Amino acid sequence: KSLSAAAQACVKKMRDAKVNEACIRTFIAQHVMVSKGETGSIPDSAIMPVDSLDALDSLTIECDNAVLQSTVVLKLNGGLGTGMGLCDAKTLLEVKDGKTFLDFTALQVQYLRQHCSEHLRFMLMDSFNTSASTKSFLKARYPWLYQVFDSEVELMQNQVPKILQDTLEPAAWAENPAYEWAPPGHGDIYTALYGSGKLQELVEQGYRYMFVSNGDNLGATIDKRVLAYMEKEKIDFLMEVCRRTESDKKGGHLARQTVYVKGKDGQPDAEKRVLLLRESAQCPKADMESFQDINKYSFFNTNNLWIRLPVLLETMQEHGGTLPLPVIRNEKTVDSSNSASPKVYQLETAMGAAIAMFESASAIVVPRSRFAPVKTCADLLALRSDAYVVTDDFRLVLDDRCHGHPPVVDLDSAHYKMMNGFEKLVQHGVPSLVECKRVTVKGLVQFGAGNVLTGTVTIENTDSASAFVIPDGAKLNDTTASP
Ligand SMILES: O=c1ccn([C@@H]2O[C@H](COP(=O)(O)OP(=O)(O)O[C@H]3O[C@H](CO)[C@@H](O)[C@H](O)[C@H]3O)[C@@H](O)[C@H]2O)c(=O)[nH]1
Numbered sequence: 463k464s465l466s467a468a469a470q471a472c473v474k475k476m477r478d479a480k481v482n483e484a485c486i487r488t489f490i491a492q493h494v495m496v497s498k499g500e501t502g503s504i505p506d507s508a509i510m511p512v513d514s515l516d517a518l519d520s521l522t523i524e525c526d527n528a529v530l531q532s533t534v535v536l537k538l539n540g541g542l543g544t545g546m547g548l549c550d551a552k553t554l555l556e557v558k559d560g561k562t563f564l565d566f567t568a569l570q571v572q573y574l575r576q577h578c579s580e581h582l583r584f585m586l587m588d589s590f591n592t593s594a595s596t597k598s599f600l601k602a603r604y605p606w607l608y609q610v611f612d613s614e615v616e617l618m619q620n621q622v623p624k625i626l627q628d629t630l631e632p633a634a635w636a637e638n639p640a641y642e643w644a645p646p647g648h649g650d651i652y653t654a655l656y657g658s659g660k661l662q663e664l665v666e667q668g669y670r671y672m673f674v675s676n677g678d679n680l681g682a683t684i685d686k687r688v689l690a691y692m693e694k695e696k697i698d699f700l701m702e703v704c705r706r707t708e709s710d711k712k713g714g715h716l717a718r719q720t721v722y723v724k725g726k727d728g729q730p731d732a733e734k735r736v737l738l739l740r741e742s743a744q745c746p747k748a749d750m751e752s753f754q755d756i757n758k759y760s761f762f763n764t765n766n767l768w769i770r771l772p773v774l775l776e777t778m779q780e781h782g783g784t785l786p787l788p789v790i791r792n793e794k795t796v797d798s799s800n801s802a803s804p805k806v807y808q809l810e811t812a813m814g815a816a817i818a819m820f821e822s823a824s825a826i827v828v829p830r831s832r833f834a835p836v837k838t839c840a841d842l843l844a845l846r847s848d849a850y851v852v853t854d855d856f857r858l859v860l861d862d863r864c865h866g867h868p869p870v871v872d873l874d875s876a877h878y879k880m881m882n883g884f885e886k887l888v889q890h891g892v893p894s895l896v897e898c899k900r901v902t903v904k905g906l907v908q909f910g911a912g913n914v915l916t917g918t919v920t921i922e923n924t925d926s927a928s929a930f931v932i933p934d935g936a937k938l939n940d941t942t943a944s945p
């Protein structure tokens with residue numbers, strides 16, 4: 463009904479493949495935007511810094527029991543960790559000896575069920591890539607989650623067609639047609655919830671809040687103070703943000719614009735702050751200077767998000783059965799491996815962008831303890847190290863000796879970008895980093911078995927025709943060590 467041939471070709475392919483209609487409506491609206499020149503770019507000049515938020519450490523009151531019992535926890539688990547050379551779910555990586563992201567995730571759920579709300583609802587948003595392996599893991603390790611995996615745990619994200627940059631038609635790939643489809647980013651959570659009927663089912667069952675976080679962030683759990691704050695302040699969507707550090711490069715920051723409140727009765731001048739998310743992908747590429755300036759944009763989205771479910775549901779129903787999140791136009795080739803395969807756009811959205819979709823939306827500053835991202839092998843190095851400790855409620859948080867500062871880890875991306883390269887680097891043990899402010903690894907190198915790094919430490923191999931192996935027991939303090 464009024465679409466371009468290319469947009470109609472997408473609808474047809476999606477209907478043929480039995481893609482849920484909410485996903486088709488959502489995708490097509492993005493497609494229309496893209497056909498009018500939209501890229502998701504948010505230039506510097508269109509936004510301003512946010513310089514005032516409440517902090518969670520300013521709160522004390524915990525929510526009532528009804529509210530608590532009404533809260534569902536969901537962990538995102540649909541991505542690929544392709545920058546870490548992973549082909550399966552990142553959450554199946556080991557984080558501490560013999561314990562994976564999924565283990566700590568399951569243990570957190572069990573803790574909450576033993577001490578807070580015995581029937582706390584727990585979900586995982588999976589994709590076709592991660593579903594099987596996740597389900598398999600829970601069957602072996604956490605039978606009580608496996609038993610209700612299909613019925614209540616797993617939410618399956620949609621897949622949407624990759625579209626040719628040429629014409630915006632759906633891309634075909636005869637050698638492997640599965641590569642014609644892509645996951646639409648974690649912003650798809652709202653569309654998959656709504657289109658599957660699970661959102662309405664949850665609201666029917668008496669659930670009122672959902673707390674979502676990234677599968678790679680084991681600092682995130684429900685804080686009953688946030689829920690009491692959302693109840694008091696009548697907030698329908700809340701983003702947790704952390705004060706941004708130099709390591710916060712892959713993700714998004716909070717920003718504002720100013721709008722002008724209803725009408726002009728009383729005075730024209732008065733205006734309201736509107737909040738939004740800018741992902742790295744949304745910064746104009748020749749202006750990453752805007753994005754990477756941690757002073758200017760110092761509130762980094764953790765992706766720990768709180769949503770009031772009935773409000774989400776009514777907002778989507780009243781907007782054509784979709785949530786109109788800003789499209790992010792990702793550029794790839796249809797076989798991302800093969801740069802001789804046709805160039806495509808992959809239309810995606812980020813779930814934190816939903817802060818722009820509700821009148822009551824806000825953000826709160828949380829301590830770093832709620833944010834332990836693992837986007838790279840360098841992050842994983844810190845996480846596995848004694849810089850991070852396991853709390854009684856099964857979060858991974860910095861040791862108190864760190865003073866809330868994660869070690870900065872700068873690993874050579876020729877050798878350690880891929881999980882195969884990283885794992886060779888820590889073959890003989892993971893170095894103590896609890897007292898390291900900054901470790902930098904240059905050229906090919908291998909840690910020894912006793913290592914302890916204190917202060918600022920560069921390990922530089924200029925040779926790397928030959929691996930620079932660190933002696934066991936070695937101690938490096940404010941020093942460059944080289945062969
Ligand atoms: O289609 C997708 C893509 C991602 N994921 C999952 O979503 C989570 C976040 O994805 P990831 O690629 O690791 O992060 P980004 O999307 O780059 O960044 C998100 O997380 C950052 C904090 O780490 C925030 O700063 C950004 O705003 C936020 O969008 C991970 O569990 C992924 O597995 C899905 O489930 N489906």
Ligand SMILES: [Mg+2]
Nearest residue numbers: 540541542543
């Ligand atoms: Mg991902």
